[PDB]
Structure 1
Amino acid sequence: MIAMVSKQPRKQRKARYAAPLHIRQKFMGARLSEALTKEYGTRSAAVITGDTVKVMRGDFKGTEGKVQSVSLMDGTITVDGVISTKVDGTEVPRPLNPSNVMITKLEMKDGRRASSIKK
């Protein structure tokens, strides 16, 4: 969150860079699918490790997979199937920005998830 109090690039980027962890949680937001947005009443939600998302920008547009990992400090997610093959030949996962993906299936093992997404 950064209000129109400060329209200065220095203050916006400082706020993003020194955002606390509870604010970096909100940086993991991604667009919900049409069904999910209709059945939740919100347009976006935070990507969580486990739920299925479709990558819609980058080299891996259209791939659906489960979030393997989430780094809040990096602001990145790790999705099943989104990998870079390294000079060894072994496959490392390529971190993605959550704004480049779209949630298609939500993980609902946590009862707090509904109010987490909205309200």
Structure 2
Amino acid sequence: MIAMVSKQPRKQRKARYAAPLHIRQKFMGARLSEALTKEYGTRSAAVITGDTVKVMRGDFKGTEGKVQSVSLMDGTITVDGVISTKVDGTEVPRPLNPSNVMITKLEMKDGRRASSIKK
């Protein structure tokens, strides 16, 4: 969250850079699929470790996979199949920005998730 109090680039970027962890949770938002947006009433939700997303920007557009890991400080997620093979040849995950993906199936093992997504 950064209000229209400050339209200045420096203040916006300072707010994002020094965001608390509970504000960095909201930075993990991603677009919901049409079915999910219809059946939740909201347009977006935070990408969580476990839910299935489709990558829609970058070198891995079209891939569907489960979120392996989320970093709040980096603001990146790791998706099954989105990897960077290194000079060894071992496969390493390539971190993705959550705004570059779309949630197609939510992980709802947490009873608090529904109210977390809306309200």
C-alpha displacement at 1:15, in angstroms?
0.2
TM-score normalised according to structure 1 size? 1.00
Identity percentage of aligned residues? 100
Please list every run of 5 or more consecutive structure 1 residues that lacks an aligned counterpart in the other structure.
none
CA distances 1:13-43 after superposition (whole Å, capped 9, x unpaired)? 0000000000000000000000000000000
Q: Distance in 1 between matches of 2:31 and 2:60?
A: 17
Please list every run of 5 or more consecutive structure 2 residues that lacks an aligned counterpart in the other structure.
none
C-alpha displacement at 1:81, in angstroms?
0.3
CA distances 1:48-76 after superposition (whole Å, capped 9, x unpaired)? 00000000000000100000000000000
Q: Distance in 1 between matches of 2:60 and 2:43?
A: 23
TM-score normalised according to structure 2 size? 1.00
Which residue is 1:93 aligned to?
93
Q: Distance in 2 between matches of 1:64 and 1:94?
A: 14
C-alpha displacement at 1:79, in angstroms?
0.4
Q: Distance in 1 between matches of 2:40 and 2:60?
A: 27
* Residues paired across the two proteins, number: 119
